[PDB]
Amino acid sequence: AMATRGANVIWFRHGLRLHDNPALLAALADKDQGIALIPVFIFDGESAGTKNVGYNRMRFLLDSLQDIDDQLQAATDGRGRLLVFEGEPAYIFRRLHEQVRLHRICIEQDCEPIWNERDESIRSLCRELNIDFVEKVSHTLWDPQLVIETNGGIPPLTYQMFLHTVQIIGLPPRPTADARLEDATFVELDPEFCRSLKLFEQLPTPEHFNVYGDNMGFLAKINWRGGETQALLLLDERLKVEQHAFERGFYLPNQALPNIHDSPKSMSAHLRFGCLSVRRFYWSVHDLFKNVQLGVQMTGGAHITGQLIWREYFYTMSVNNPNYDRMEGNDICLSIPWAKPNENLLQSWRLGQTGFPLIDGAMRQLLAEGWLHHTLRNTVATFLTRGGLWQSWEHGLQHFLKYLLDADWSVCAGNWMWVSSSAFERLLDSSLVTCPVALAKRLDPDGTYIKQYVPELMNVPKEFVHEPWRMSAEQQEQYECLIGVHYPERIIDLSMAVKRNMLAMKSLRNSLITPPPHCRPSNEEEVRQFFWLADV
Amino acid sequence: ATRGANVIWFRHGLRLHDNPALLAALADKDQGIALIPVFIFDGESAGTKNVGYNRMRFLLDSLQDIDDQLQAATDGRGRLLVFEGEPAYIFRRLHEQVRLHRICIEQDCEPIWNERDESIRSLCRELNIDFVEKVSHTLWDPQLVIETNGGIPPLTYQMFLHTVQIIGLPPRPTADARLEDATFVELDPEFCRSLKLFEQLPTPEHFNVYGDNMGFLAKINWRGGETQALLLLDERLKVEQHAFERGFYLPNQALPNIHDSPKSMSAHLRFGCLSVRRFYWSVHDLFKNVQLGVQMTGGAHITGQLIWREYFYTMSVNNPNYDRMEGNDICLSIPWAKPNENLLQSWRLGQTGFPLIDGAMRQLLAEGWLHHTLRNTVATFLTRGGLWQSWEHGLQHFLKYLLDADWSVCAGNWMWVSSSAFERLLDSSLVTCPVALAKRLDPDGTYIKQYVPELMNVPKEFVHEPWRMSAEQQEQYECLIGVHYPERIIDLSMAVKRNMLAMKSLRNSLITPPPHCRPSNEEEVRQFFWLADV
Numbered sequence A: 001a002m003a004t005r006g007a008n009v010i011w012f013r014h015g016l017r018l019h020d021n022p023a024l025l026a027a028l029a030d031k032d033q034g035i036a037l038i039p040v041f042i043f044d045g046e047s048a049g050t051k052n053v054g055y056n057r058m059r060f061l062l063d064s065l066q067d068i069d070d071q072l073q074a075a076t077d078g079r080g081r082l083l084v085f086e087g088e089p090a091y092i093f094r095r096l097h098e099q100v101r102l103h104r105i106c107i108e109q110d111c112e113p114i115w116n117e118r119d120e121s122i123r124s125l126c127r128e129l130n131i132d133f134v135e136k137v138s139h140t141l142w143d144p145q146l147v148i149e150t151n152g153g154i155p156p157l158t159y160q161m162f163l164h165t166v167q168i169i170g171l172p173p174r175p176t177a178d179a180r181l182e183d184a185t186f187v188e189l190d191p192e193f194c195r196s197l198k199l200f201e202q203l204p205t206p207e208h209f210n211v212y213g214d215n216m217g218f219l220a221k222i223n224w225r226g227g228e229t230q231a232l233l234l235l236d237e238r239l240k241v242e243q244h245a246f247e248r249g250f251y252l253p254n255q256a257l258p259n260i261h262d263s264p265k266s267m268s269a270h271l272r273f274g275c276l277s278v279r280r281f282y283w284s285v286h287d288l289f290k291n292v293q294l295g296v297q298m299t300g301g302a303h304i305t306g307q308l309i310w311r312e313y314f315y316t317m318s319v320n321n322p323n324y325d326r327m328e329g330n331d332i333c334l335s336i337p338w339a340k341p342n343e344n345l346l347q348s349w350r351l352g353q354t355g356f357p358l359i360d361g362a363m364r365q366l367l368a369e370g371w372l373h374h375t376l377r378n379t380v381a382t383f384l385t386r387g388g389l390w391q392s393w394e395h396g397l398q399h400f401l402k403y404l405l406d407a408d409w410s411v412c413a414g415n416w417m418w419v420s421s422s423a424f425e426r427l428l429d430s431s432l433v434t435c436p437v438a439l440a441k442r443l444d445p446d447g448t449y450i451k452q453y454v455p456e457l458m459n460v461p462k463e464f465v466h467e468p469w470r471m472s473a474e475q476q477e478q479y480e481c482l483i484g485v486h487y488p489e490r491i492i493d494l495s496m497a498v499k500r501n502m503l504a505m506k507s508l509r510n511s512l513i514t515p516p517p518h519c520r521p522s523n524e525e526e527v528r529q530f531f532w533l534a535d536v
Numbered sequence B: 001a002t003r004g005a006n007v008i009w010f011r012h013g014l015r016l017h018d019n020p021a022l023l024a025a026l027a028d029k030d031q032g033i034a035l036i037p038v039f040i041f042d043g044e045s046a047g048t049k050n051v052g053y054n055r056m057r058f059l060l061d062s063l064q065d066i067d068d069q070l071q072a073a074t075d076g077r078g079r080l081l082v083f084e085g086e087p088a089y090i091f092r093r094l095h096e097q098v099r100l101h102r103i104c105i106e107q108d109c110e111p112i113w114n115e116r117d118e119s120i121r122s123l124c125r126e127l128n129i130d131f132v133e134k135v136s137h138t139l140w141d142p143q144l145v146i147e148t149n150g151g152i153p154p155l156t157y158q159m160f161l162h163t164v165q166i167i168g169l170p171p172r173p174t175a176d177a178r179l180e181d182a183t184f185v186e187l188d189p190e191f192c193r194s195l196k197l198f199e200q201l202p203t204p205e206h207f208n209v210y211g212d213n214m215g216f217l218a219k220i221n222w223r224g225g226e227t228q229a230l231l232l233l234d235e236r237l238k239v240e241q242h243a244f245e246r247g248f249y250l251p252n253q254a255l256p257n258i259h260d261s262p263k264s265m266s267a268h269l270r271f272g273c274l275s276v277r278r279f280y281w282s283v284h285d286l287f288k289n290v291q292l293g294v295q296m297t298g299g300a301h302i303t304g305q306l307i308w309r310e311y312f313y314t315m316s317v318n319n320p321n322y323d324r325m326e327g328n329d330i331c332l333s334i335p336w337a338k339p340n341e342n343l344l345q346s347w348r349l350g351q352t353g354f355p356l357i358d359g360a361m362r363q364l365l366a367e368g369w370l371h372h373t374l375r376n377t378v379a380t381f382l383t384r385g386g387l388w389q390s391w392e393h394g395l396q397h398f399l400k401y402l403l404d405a406d407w408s409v410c411a412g413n414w415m416w417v418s419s420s421a422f423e424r425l426l427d428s429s430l431v432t433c434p435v436a437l438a439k440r441l442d443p444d445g446t447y448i449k450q451y452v453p454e455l456m457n458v459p460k461e462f463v464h465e466p467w468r469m470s471a472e473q474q475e476q477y478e479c480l481i482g483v484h485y486p487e488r489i490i491d492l493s494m495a496v497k498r499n500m501l502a503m504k505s506l507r508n509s510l511i512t513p514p515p516h517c518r519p520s521n522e523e524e525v526r527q528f529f530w531l532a533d534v
C-alpha cells in the first residue's frame, strides 16, 4: 500500500544537517499525498571525502551521521531513520526504486568537479527511471555558477575580485525554514533486500573501512564532536564571543596575537560537512549587528563574515577546474620549478622531525588531532614550499587532505596554491613570513605549545626551547636533549634556502615578464592580515 | 521704506553650502525680501578672544572667501557686511534703517555662546523679528542626543555611538543656496561709518594681532575658506578611495605621518568652511553602494573621526565649566603641581630639551597645526606623563595658537588624555617616552631637524638623544647641550615614578570611579594614541 504510494530520497553526502536543507524540504513537499521520505547516506569510497581519509576525519563524519540518525528518531517517535549503505549509488538507487517507487531524489549540490562523475551517473539514472533529480544549492553562500557567470564566465582569482563580483549580485539567500518531520512517512524495506544491498544495522566504525586510530605513529586524539547538534552549540558560543569582541572595540584580528593554545572551538570541520549551514552562520552574524550598524561605520562581525567568503572564494574557483589540485594542466596556478620529490625531507616534514620546534609541533598536532590554527598552516606550508624545502605544494595538499578534520578539496588546494605559488607577491618571500623561530617566540613565548607537542624538549629551559641548537654540548647533556639524538638536527639551512628560493622566485618572475592570471593575494595588506603579521 | 530684509549672520558656519540658515534667510525672495549677509567682530565670535596671528588669518581668509563668492554669484550686487561692535547694538541700528523680518543663524551649541545668542533672542522678541536658528555645525542636534541618553551627555565615545545608533543617521546636507536672483540692501554711507562697517576686510594687526608667535615668524601653510575646504574634501575622498582599494581600514596598519602635507580640514570644520554633514555623507555615498551586509567597507575610520568631534561638542553643551577642573563635574579633580612659570614657558617655547616635544611645540607656534599623535605627546608630557602641571595651562596655550581650537574639542581632548586616572595604560612611560616615540615617528630625525634647527648637524645616531654626544662630538656638530640646545628640563624616569604614584593614590582615594570623560576601553586608547602593538 505505502510501497505502492512511493517515496522521495534525501541523499546526504555533504549537507549533514536537518536545518537549512532545501533538498530535504523538497523531499518532504509531497507529504500530503502520502509520499514517504527515505533519508540516505552511501559509503562510496568517495563521498564526503572518504577516498583519502584518516581516523580523525572518519570519526568526525561518523559522528555527524549518528547525529542525523538520532534527530530523525527523536522527531518521529522512532519511525524515521538514516539508511546507511555501502556500495555504488547508481546500483543502490536502481534496486531501491524496485522496492518502492522513487518520485524524487533530492541532493544538496556539490560544486567541486570531483563530484561531477558521481552526480552525472545519478542524473543519467533518473532519466532512465523517470525519477525527478532535485538539486538544491545550500553548501555555499551563493550559486557559484551565478558568481562565475556574473564575472564574465570565469572565476575570480583574487579575494577582492570575488567581493566585487558578489557586491554586484547582492546578499546571499537566507537559511530556509526548519523541516517538519512530525507527520512524515518512512518505508519498511524487505529485510532480505536490506541484507543484500548492504544496509548497515549499526553505524560502522572507522576500522570497518580499514581506518585505524593510528596516524603515522601517533595515537589519535579526538577533541572534536562532529554533527549538527554540536555545530549549533559552537555557533552560539562564537556569536557571544563576537558580541564581547565588538563591545571591547576589537574589529580586525591584528589587534590580538593568534592564539594557538586555544580550545577546540572552530567550526571548520562542521562547515566542511555541512553540519552547520554557512548561510545560517552568515545571517545570524549579520542580524546580530546590522540593527546597531550606523551607515558605513564599523560594526561587529565584519571579519568573521569575510572569513566565510574566503571559503566561498576557493570553492567557487574550483568549479570548472578538474586540475585544481595539481600544478600541471592547471591554468590558474603558476608553473614553478619545484625540486624533485625528496622522500626523506617529505617524511621528516610529515612526521614533525624537521628540527625546527614550531614546525615539528604543528605537524605532530596535525597527526594527533587533525586541526591547526590558520597561522600554523601558513608556517608549515611556507616551510614545505617557497620559504623552505622548495618541495611542491602538491605533497603538502595530499598530506593535509588525509589528516585534517576539514580538508575541503577546493579550500585546501586553494590555500596551498595561494600561499606557495604567488610568485609576484614579494612580501611572501620575506623572512618575517618565513622564519619559524621568530614566529615561535611570538606565538608561544614560554614554550607551552612546543613542549606539549614536542615532548623531548620538555626539560629545555625557555631560553633555548625555540632554538635548541644554540645549547652547548654540556647544556644538551644537562637537559637530556642531544641534537641529532633526542631531537633531530635541522633538516635544512633556512638562511641559504631563503636566499636560494628568493633568487628562484625572482628568476621565475623574470621569465614571465608579465603575470598571467593566477590564484593570488589581492594586495600586500591582504597578505598581512592573511598571515597575521606583526606591524613591521 | 518698509520692504524688509533677512539677516544671515555668520559666526561659525562660514560657507554657502549646506546652510539651512542661509536657505531660510533666502526663502522670502519671492516677496522681495532682501538678504543681508553679516559677520561681526564682537570680541569673541568665531573664537576671536584668545587668538593668535595664524588663526586670525585663517578666519579672515574664510570671510574673504564668502565675500568673493557672494560677489561672483550676483555680478557684484551681493556683499558680505562685516562690522566691529556689539551684535545687539548693531542689529538694533540696522533695523532702524531697514526692517528686519528674520535674523538667521547656524546654532552655536557651546555654552560660551549662550549669553551672546540670548541677547539677540531677547532683541528679536522686542522688535518683532523672527529669530531663526538651524542645526548644521554638528551632525545631529546635540540636544536630541542628550535627551536620548537620559538627559546627560555621554562621557564615553562608545556610549556616544550607542546613543546615536538609537537616533539613526544624521541629516543629509541641504541643497545649495540660490543667490543669483537675490536682492541686497544699500545702506546710508553715514550709517555705515557710525556703525563701523568695514570697507576692506581688516587685517589681523587691526585687532592688535601680529605675525610673531612667541618669537616665531608666522608660517602660513593653510588657506582658510569654503573654496579651499571643498578642494581638500575632494582630495581626501580620493585618498579614502585608494586606501580602501589597497586594503587599509583601521589604520593601526600605517604609521602616523607627522611630516605630511597640509591636507587636514580640522580648521575648516571648526569654522564651518566645510559642512560636517557634507563630509559625512560624501564618505558614506562613496562606499555604501558597494558595502555588503555587515562586511567592512571604505571610510569606516574617517566617519568615526567625525563622531569624535560630535562626542566632545555634545559633552560641553550644558557645562559652562567644561574648560576647567574645579566645578567641572565630568573631570576628576587631580592634584596637579602648582604653576611653575619657568617650566610652563619652557614647554610653550619648545625649550624642554626633548627633541620631539620641542619640535612639535615650535611647529605649533609657527604653523598652528599638529598631528594628533604630537598633540598627545606634548599633552601627556605637560601633565601626568611629565611635568605634572594642570591641563588648563595646556588648553589656554592650545586655544590661542591652534588653527582649529574648538573650545569643546580642545578642552575635551585635554581632559580625556590627561585626567583619565583609571586607564593605567596611559600611565606607562612607554606611551609617555618622547625619545622612543621620536625614533618611531621620526626615525631619521627629518621632522626634528626642521622645527629644531640647532640640531641640524647632529648625526642620525644622536639626533633623538643629543645629550649622548661626548664633549668632542657636541663641539664637532655645533650643538653644546645647555648652550645651543637646552638640557632636559626634567628627569623623566624619576618623574614617571613620582607621577604613577600620585595617580595610584588618586585612584585609591576614590574607592569607586565617578562619572568622568574617559576612554571607553583599552583598545580605544590604543587607537587614539596610535600605539605600536609592541
Ligand SMILES: Cc1cc2nc3c(=O)[nH]c(=O)nc-3n(C[C@H](O)[C@H](O)[C@H](O)COP(=O)(O)OP(=O)(O)OC[C@H]3O[C@@H](n4cnc5c(N)ncnc54)[C@H](O)[C@@H]3O)c2cc1C
Residues within 6 Å of the ligand: A265, A266, A267, A268, A269, A271, A272, A304, A307, A308, A310, A311, A312, A314, A372, A373, A374, A375, A377, A378, A381, A400, A404, A406, A407, A408, A409, A411, A412, A413, A415, A416, A419
Ligand atoms: C595550507 C592551508 C590549508 C588549508 N586548508 C583548509 C581546509 O582544508 N579547509 C578549511 O576550511 N580551511 C583551510 N585553510 C584555511 C584556514 O586556516 C582554516 O579555515 C582556519 O584555520 C579555520 O579555523 P577557524 O574556524 O577558527 O577560522 P575562522 O577565522 O574563525 O573563520 C571561520 C571560517 O571561515 C572559513 N575560513 C577562514 N579562513 C579561511 C581561508 N583562509 N580559506 C577558506 N576559508 C576560510 C573557514 O570555514 C572557517 O571555519 C587552510 C589554510 C592553509 C594555509
Ligand SMILES: Cc1cc2nc3c(=O)[nH]c(=O)nc-3n(C[C@H](O)[C@H](O)[C@H](O)COP(=O)(O)OP(=O)(O)OC[C@H]3O[C@@H](n4cnc5c(N)ncnc54)[C@H](O)[C@@H]3O)c2cc1C
Residues within 6 Å of the ligand: B263, B264, B265, B266, B267, B269, B270, B302, B305, B306, B308, B309, B310, B312, B370, B371, B372, B373, B375, B376, B379, B398, B402, B404, B405, B406, B407, B409, B410, B411, B413, B414, B417
Ligand atoms: C590635546 C589635544 C587637543 C586637541 N584639540 C583639538 C581641537 O582644538 N580641534 C580639533 O578639531 N581637534 C583637536 N584634537 C584632536 C585631533 O588631534 C585633531 O582633530 C586632528 O589632529 C586633526 O587632524 P586631521 O584632520 O588630519 O584628523 P583626521 O583623523 O583626518 O580626522 C578628521 C576630523 O575628525 C575630527 N577628529 C579627529 N580626531 C578627533 C579627536 N580626537 N577629537 C575630536 N575630533 C576629532 C576632526 O574634526 C578632524 O579634522 C586635539 C587632540 C588633543 C590630544
Ligand SMILES: [N+]
Residues within 6 Å of the ligand: A020, A138, A139, A140, A141, A277, A278, A279, A280
Ligand atoms: N547554507
Ligand SMILES: [N+]
Residues within 6 Å of the ligand: B203, B204, B205, B211
Ligand atoms: N599681515
Ligand code: NA
Residues within 6 Å of the ligand: A267, A268, A269, A271, A272, A311, A406, A408
Ligand atoms: Na571550513
